[PDB]
């Protein structure tokens, strides 16, 4: 902490990958008149 | 029971009568209440002295100047001696031995 | 063209692949925490910490150099435990140039620290001079 | 008729020196031989632990091949 | 992000798609021996290394396959994963040899005979090296044993059920022993000390179990199974 | 609803932390309420419309979802 | 550790102990196989756990209490007699048999380096144990014999040096402090017998 | 190097001692000669030779005074 | 060897001897030229052969006899007076002139640390030779 270190923890890929994607996806903002990549990409039903 | 004389510090390790309750190197003041009367309390950085625990946060030991003090055995509060406690605690077991 | 849109890096075109993942060379780090029971530290990168898995101290850590260690014919083990210090700078060499495979090579001090812990007043000169 | 029984037996381990600390043997350790006449493998079924100050340990083993070659 | 479909049930889980030859414009399909491996293994995360810890790897191969392609490996890292005998033994190594590594030579004697604990065999060796010999007074002082009894190594009695029933009647002769725990500990230890050693078969936990049932039922349990057990 | 002494680690750096443990079990983890529970809750709700009654205070204090007893 | 040559020409250096079956890190020159060099020697986790007396599992080095145990230049020679230093005033050195040298200043630690009655036993020192609570047996149990022999060749006066003095200690406990002039055939000894 | 004195961490005076003992020797008899060169924090010096089994001792003692 | 700071703030460490014309292994940071660090100092075969008193050509370290000679922490200071330790009970230390300190327990080795008549000469000790 204080430093930019971030740790992701999970007992499976779908748990880790959820945390990885969810960490950065919302803040990736763009000028879409209607949302961002999270509405257009489901990235669900992982196992 | 007999044990084995002089019962220098060795006995507690190689003479098997004891099982450790708390290890050396950690020192928590909240987990003192969980102790029970008769627990052996160590003292000193090189196991210089030991003691017997009694309730109400006290212990029984001899304390005095090093060169053969004339002070008799006595009971002291644990608050002042808590600094030199070293966290090591052991307990007796007689049913299963031999 | 259409097919060129792949992983690439550099001003000159270079195919980025599993070679780029492998580190080339040695890197420095600082000692943040030490496992005193096993005497295996965990070093921090500028924004990452190496070693330091779920294993408390024994089953995963970074090894430290020893002066000498061995076993006698009788069987008894002998060796050394060199002093370990927190916040010192240590050189690291990864096994087979793989990240997630660290080892400490040696411990190097800062220029100020080195200047403080020496009593030599000479600025310079060949070692062969008697004076 | 009923099927064949897997061979099993005891295997003896000799160490250079008595162990200074307790060691754990991973489950499914494979025991084999080097003679060409018996290249049949073996494997353990349960955990075992080598307590310190013990110069030898014996663990049971079961022949994976179902036949008289064990 | 899903597990690979090469598993049997996961392969069947994929949706099927049909296409007849009637939609085929051109085809270029055939076998190839570009990929060929014999040994397959999944190493754990690359920090763990064979010379400083637990089991490193565990590969798999077919005996027929390796004939054509020998030892072709395929590796992938996965981020996720007896007074006389005792004295003779000391006399066999000699005081010069025993004096070098008394702690570990002690483990040799305790390994061979599980009657002696580490402390017991540690003390006898120290007395042997310093004095240069060990007598029957030294041995018995270390631990109470019948040194003057050579029967046991050749022949030791069977201890059929009625003998145990008789030995319990010797060790517990008055009812106060059940009521006074202090002597009860002394009594039961004396029972176990002879009962484990003197006869054909000895076990602590089993004999303890019998003693705990015996004590609870005041020495007359409701079934003879207590003496069978 | 994990058993006792299940949460061992904090899954982070834990530089100043040695170990973590829980002395009591988790019992608040529950599945969705069945029809019968909803009917019981609703009959207390119907009987709790008049205030200044013990049966009313029962619903009054049971309205929070987390409360069970 | 270090190696060089003096202006006079004589070579000086060190020969660190080498051990068979130890794990050593290697760095090839110019990343060429068939060009090895050893960088350092790293021990196993078990070996490291055995050769340390620190009971603390962990903690920042800056803590005063942790400094008492962490700060310990603990070293063991090829001979099983060891050498010990600490950030506190305790310092312990061992020799053949149970003989040892020790020093300390805290009254709490006064037993570690006392001489009351028979003196402190070797088993009382907590540094004399391996990490897995086994005593550190000395390899050689026979008592040593020490001596501090002093002599020279010349001095600024220009006359030849011929004063010899010793502080010999025998295996039987004798002590002999002597001053000698060999050329003049004169000696004065202060001797202590084992009796 | 930066002309500051190297303060010792601990200012309390130490107490030294050179304890000597063994187990046996080539004669075969048990070793029981104990000798010490104890130095106290108050400046005392005590050179002593001891035979513990025979209960005999000879000490050369120096007091702080 | 080691370097750090105490809780009080005072800095502590070591200054190992440095020698001119010695061979040193170097490891560049991130495999970049113009980023050197010294890893260790390795001596020449001749120098190593000169500063050891082991006469054995070879042999497994586990042999009792080989342990007598192999197991020798032999070190020489910048001053030509040296320090010696061994797996046996022999241990020898030297100071200015022919003065030395020695200890041993074996009767065979008794001359090495004796004080009979004038005492053992410095030339009698076999560790005192290159």
Coordinates of C-alpha atoms in Angstrom, one line a residue, chain C residues 31-36 39 41 81-88, chain F residues 15-16, chain G residues 54 56 58-73 86-87, chain H residues 9, chain I residues 2-12:
Chain C
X31 CA 14.1 -6.1 1.6
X32 CA 10.7 -5.3 3.1
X33 CA 10.1 -8.4 5.3
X34 CA 12.2 -11.3 6.6
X35 CA 11.2 -14.8 7.7
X36 CA 13.4 -15.1 10.7
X39 CA 15.9 -16.7 7.1
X41 CA 13.3 -12.7 2.8
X81 CA 23.6 -17.5 9.3
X82 CA 24.9 -14.1 7.9
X83 CA 23.1 -11.1 9.3
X84 CA 20.0 -9.9 7.4
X85 CA 18.8 -6.3 7.4
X86 CA 15.6 -4.7 6.4
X87 CA 15.6 -1.9 3.7
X88 CA 18.9 -3.0 2.2
Chain F
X15 CA 3.6 -7.8 6.7
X16 CA 2.6 -7.1 10.3
Chain G
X54 CA 15.5 -17.0 16.3
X56 CA 10.2 -15.0 16.1
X58 CA 8.2 -12.4 11.6
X59 CA 8.1 -8.7 12.3
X60 CA 9.7 -5.5 11.2
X61 CA 13.4 -5.2 11.9
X62 CA 13.0 -1.6 13.3
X63 CA 11.2 -2.9 16.4
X64 CA 13.3 -2.7 19.6
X65 CA 12.2 -6.1 20.8
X66 CA 12.7 -7.8 17.4
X67 CA 16.2 -6.2 17.3
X68 CA 17.2 -8.4 20.3
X69 CA 16.7 -11.6 18.4
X70 CA 16.9 -10.6 14.7
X71 CA 20.3 -8.9 15.1
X72 CA 22.4 -12.0 15.7
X73 CA 25.5 -12.8 13.6
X86 CA 24.3 -10.0 18.9
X87 CA 23.1 -6.5 18.7
Chain H
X9 CA 25.2 0.8 21.6
Chain I
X2 CA 25.8 -7.2 5.6
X3 CA 24.7 -3.7 6.1
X4 CA 21.7 -2.0 7.7
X5 CA 20.4 0.5 10.3
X6 CA 19.4 0.0 13.9
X7 CA 16.1 1.3 15.4
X8 CA 18.0 4.0 17.1
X9 CA 19.1 5.2 13.6
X10 CA 22.8 4.4 13.7
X11 CA 24.1 2.7 10.6
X12 CA 26.1 -0.5 10.7

